[PDB]
Amino acid sequence: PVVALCNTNTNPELVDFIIPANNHQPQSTCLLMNLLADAVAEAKAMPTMFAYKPDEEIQIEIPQKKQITSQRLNITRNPEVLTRE
Amino acid sequence: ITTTKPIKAHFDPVADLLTKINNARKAKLMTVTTIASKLKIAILEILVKEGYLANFQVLENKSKTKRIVTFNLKYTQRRIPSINGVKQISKPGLRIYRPFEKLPLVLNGLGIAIISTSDGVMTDKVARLKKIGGEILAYVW
Amino acid sequence: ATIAQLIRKPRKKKKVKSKSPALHYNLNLLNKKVTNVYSPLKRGVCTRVGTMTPKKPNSALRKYAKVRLTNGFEVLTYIPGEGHNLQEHSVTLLRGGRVKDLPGVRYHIVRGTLDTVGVEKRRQQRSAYGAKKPK
RNA sequence: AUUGGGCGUAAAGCAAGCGCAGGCGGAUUGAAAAGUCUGGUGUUAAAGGCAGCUGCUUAACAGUUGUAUGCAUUGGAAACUAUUAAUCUAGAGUGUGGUAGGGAGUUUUGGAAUUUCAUGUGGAGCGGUGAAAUGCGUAGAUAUAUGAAGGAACACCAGUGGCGAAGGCGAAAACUUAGGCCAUUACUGACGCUUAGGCUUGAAAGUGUGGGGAGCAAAUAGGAUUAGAUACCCUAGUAGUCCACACCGUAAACGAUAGAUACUAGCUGUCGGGGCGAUCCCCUCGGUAGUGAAGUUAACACAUUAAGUAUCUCGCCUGG
RNA sequence: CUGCUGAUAAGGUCUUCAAAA
Ligand SMILES: [Mg+2]
Ligand SMILES: [Mg+2]
Ligand SMILES: [Mg+2]
Ligand SMILES: [Mg+2]
Ligand SMILES: [Mg+2]
Ligand SMILES: [Mg+2]
Ligand SMILES: [Mg+2]
Ligand SMILES: [Mg+2]
Ligand SMILES: [Mg+2]
Ligand SMILES: [Mg+2]
Ligand SMILES: [Mg+2]
Ligand SMILES: [Mg+2]
Ligand SMILES: [Mg+2]
Ligand SMILES: [Mg+2]
Ligand SMILES: [Mg+2]
Ligand SMILES: [Mg+2]
Ligand SMILES: [Mg+2]
Ligand SMILES: [Mg+2]
Ligand SMILES: [Mg+2]
Ligand SMILES: [Mg+2]
Ligand SMILES: [Mg+2]
Numbered sequence: 147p148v149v150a151l152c153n154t155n156t157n158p159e160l161v162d163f164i165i166p167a168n169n170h171q172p173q174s175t176c177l178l179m180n181l182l183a184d185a186v187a188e189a190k191a192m193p194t195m196f197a198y199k200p201d202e203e204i205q206i207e208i209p210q211k212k213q214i215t216s217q218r219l220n221i222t223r224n225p226e227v228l229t230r231e
Numbered sequence: 232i233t234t235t236k237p238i239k240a241h242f243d244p245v246a247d248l249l250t251k252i253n254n255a256r257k258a259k260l261m262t263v264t265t266i267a268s269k270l271k272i273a274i275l276e277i278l279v280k281e282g283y284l285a286n287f288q289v290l291e292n293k294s295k296t297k298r299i300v301t302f303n304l305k306y307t308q309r310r311i312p313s314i315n316g317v318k319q320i321s322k323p324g325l326r327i328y329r330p331f332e333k334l335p336l337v338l339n340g341l342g343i344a345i346i347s348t349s350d351g352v353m354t355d356k357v358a359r360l361k362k363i364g365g366e367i368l369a370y371v372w
Numbered sequence: 373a374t375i376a377q378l379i380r381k382p383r384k385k386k387k388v389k390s391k392s393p394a395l396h397y398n399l400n401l402l403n404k405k406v407t408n409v410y411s412p413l414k415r416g417v418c419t420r421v422g423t424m425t426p427k428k429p430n431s432a433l434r435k436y437a438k439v440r441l442t443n444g445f446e447v448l449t450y451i452p453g454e455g456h457n458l459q460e461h462s463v464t465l466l467r468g469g470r471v472k473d474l475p476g477v478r479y480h481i482v483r484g485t486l487d488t489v490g491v492e493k494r495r496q497q498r499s500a501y502g503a504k505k506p507k
Numbered sequence: 508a509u510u511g512g513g514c515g516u517a518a519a520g521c522a523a524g525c526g527c528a529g530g531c532g533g534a535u536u537g538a539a540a541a542g543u544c545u546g547g548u549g550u551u552a553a554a555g556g557c558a559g560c561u562g563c564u565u566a567a568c569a570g571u572u573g574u575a576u577g578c579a580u581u582g583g584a585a586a587c588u589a590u591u592a593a594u595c596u597a598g599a600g601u602g603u604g605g606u607a608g609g610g611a612g613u614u615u616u617g618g619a620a621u622u623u624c625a626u627g628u629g630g631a632g633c634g635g636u637g638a639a640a641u642g643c644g645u646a647g648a649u650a651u652a653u654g655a656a657g658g659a660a661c662a663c664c665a666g667u668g669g670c671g672a673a674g675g676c677g678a679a680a681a682c683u684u685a686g687g688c689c690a691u692u693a694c695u696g697a698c699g700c701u702u703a704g705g706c707u708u709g710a711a712a713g714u715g716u717g718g719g720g721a722g723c724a725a726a727u728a729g730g731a732u733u734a735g736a737u738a739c740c741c742u743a744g745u746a747g748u749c750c751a752c753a754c755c756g757u758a759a760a761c762g763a764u765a766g767a768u769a770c771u772a773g774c775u776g777u778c779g780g781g782g783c784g785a786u787c788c789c790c791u792c793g794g795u796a797g798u799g800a801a802g803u804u805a806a807c808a809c810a811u812u813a814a815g816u817a818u819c820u821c822g823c824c825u826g827g
Numbered sequence: 828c829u830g831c832u833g834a835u836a837a838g839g840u841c842u843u844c845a846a847a848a
Contacts, residue, residue: 246817254770270586
């Protein structure tokens with residue numbers, strides 16, 4: 147079994163437990179990864195981190211380095227493969 | 232029911248439907264539409280009776296001058312169809328006529344053979360029961 | 373192709389040619405006509421004896437004979453044996469065959485059936501070469 | 508290869524088009540029943556084949572019983588094909604309205620550049636090559652400036668482009684003229700697809716008659732290189748290349764892929780019509796390209812402009 | 828930075844084997 151955070155560009159056949167999600171946002175990936183880790187940690191019995199928690203404990207920050215930009219750019223680095231004679 | 236795209240059909244009524252069904256099966260498409268003819272309506276009725284399709288539904292224009300039939304394939308939960316293949320026998324030009332003695336058995340009885348003898352289209356088993364045969368349209372298994 | 377196309381011009385089957393054509397021609401000698409009657413083995417008369425060289429790989433001197441049959445065809449025939457009594461003018465009895473080394477040769481001579489003597493000094497596979505049983 | 512094969516690169520899609528006969532062909536109603544299915548009857552000689560049995564010591568063999576196929580006639584079935592009598596618009600055309608084009612023919616016009624000739628300045632070379640030599644030049648060449656004549660081809664625009672069925676089409680204009688795309692509450696009402704035979708067009712070379720000839724250049728002559736050079740290089744050079752009228756009818760005439768029709772993921776450009784109204788960009792309908800999954804393939808690759816799922820028609824292939 | 832630069836007699840080995848340890 148393999149679970150994954152599919153992000154609109156993945157082949158659904160390969161993944162068994164598909165989780166439609168984001169993969170580019172460092173907040174979304176963190177939230178979902180920590181949710182899976184929370185499942186694991188609850189099963190192996192420690193206190194949870196994000197699951198079954200209110201807003202004051204689910205809240206998170208946006209890493210450094212208006213709104214956040216989940217836009218895929220840099221198409222100019224996709225030239226035609228070297229050809230011609 | 233309202234549509235948006237133009238609807239066209241081939242001149243050959245059996246193989247038009249067979250091509251539509253085969254392409255839908257291969258592409259996992261569920262609902263398809265085509266022009267309605269009475270041979271096609273009867274053949275779709277027997278396919279629905281034999282359980283190879285979910286539903287077939289005929290519709291008529293507001294002026295009662297055009298009729299179109301739309302049908303859906305029967306996919307299971309894991310999305311694999313009940314139809315495995317289609318092959319047409321009585322193509323235009325070479326029409327296949329077989330008496331009762333030579334009525335074919337498709338895939339050792341797993342599939343069905345469409346035969347339009349004298350009472351409209353008719354499955355192979357019921358044709359054998361009635362002891363009479365005729366034109367053989369297509370093999371569906 | 374197409375049912376109509378084959379109805380108009382049906383399938384023509386490729387012809388079949390024999391491997392020993394000269395054995396299936398019969399000359400009447402009264403009306404002087406040649407008819408196609410199949411015959412297993414035919415009598416001929418030799419004209420020139422000698423040796424030929426095998427094609428590419430083999431290297432030897434193989435005994436051939438230009439024999440004219442009871443019909444009007446002259447064929448090059450390989451004498452299958454070690455030593456021969458052919459004297460440029462004799463009657464032999466050709467059968468079908470094909471030696472691979474010599475190009476153009478497509479017949480063999482049955483040994484020890486007619487004027488041509490058999491192959492003595494042979495105890496193995498002699499029934500093919502016409503040798504009396506040692507007893 | 509009807510059952511039972513193929514034609515991009517292995518043999519095989521005619522160079523392309525207009526197409527008579529033939530083959531195939533939208534939807535609904537009625538009749539008849541030519542195809543199709545089925546019942547009765549007559550017949551399909553005997554021997555032979557298959558099944559059963561008997562007799563030869565069993566067998567081979569002999570004998571005996573059963574055992575199909577097709578044709579004709581008569582009686583029914585009416586789903587499909589064909590025929591006939593009609594209705595309908597969705598295929599295909601026509602009309603009106605938008606509209607893009609190097610589509611074609613005929614007749615005129617224009618400017619750069621080469622060559623020749625004329626007239627001035629000038630004075631030893633120019634040309635050509637790997638290096639040179641034939642060749643041109645003190646009769647003033649090459650160069651420079653002006654002018655005239657004539658012929659052929661039309662820089663830039665010019666394209667990750669447009670048009671035609673193919674060959675093919677690019678300076679400007681006029682006249683005549685062919686097809687195509689988009690939207691149609693309009694009209695005819697299956698009039699359509701393919702096409703053996705037939706007809707039309709068909710790069711360049713080549714032919715015949717008459718014109719034209721600036722440049723280039725098969726054949727030809729000379730100088731080089733070379734063991735030789737009838738070739739590659741150079742200097743000259745006729746036919747030809749150009750126009751009109753008649754033929755020839757072949758090309759790697761290639762997308763190495765016949766035409767028509769329906770269906771099957773997506774993404775990126777570009778060209779035209781239409782919807783909105785600065786451009787740009789958005790949507791719809793089509794043309795032309797790239798990338799790309801299912802699917803196909805021996806592999807390369809094709810992949811909504813198919814080589815995929817299928818049908819129809821024509822042409823073609825059967826080892827070297 | 829384009830000189831020149833042509834030819835090489837005939838036939839041939841070489842995989843025995845996995846049954847198996
Ligand atoms: Mg083959
Ligand atoms: Mg070929
Ligand atoms: Mg072609
Ligand atoms: Mg060809
Ligand atoms: Mg046409
Ligand atoms: Mg016709
Ligand atoms: Mg019909
Ligand atoms: Mg009989
Ligand atoms: Mg008997
Ligand atoms: Mg001048
Ligand atoms: Mg010419
Ligand atoms: Mg000379
Ligand atoms: Mg050389
Ligand atoms: Mg010259
Ligand atoms: Mg001449
Ligand atoms: Mg040719
Ligand atoms: Mg061309
Ligand atoms: Mg590709
Ligand atoms: Mg041959
Ligand atoms: Mg040298
Ligand atoms: Mg030599």
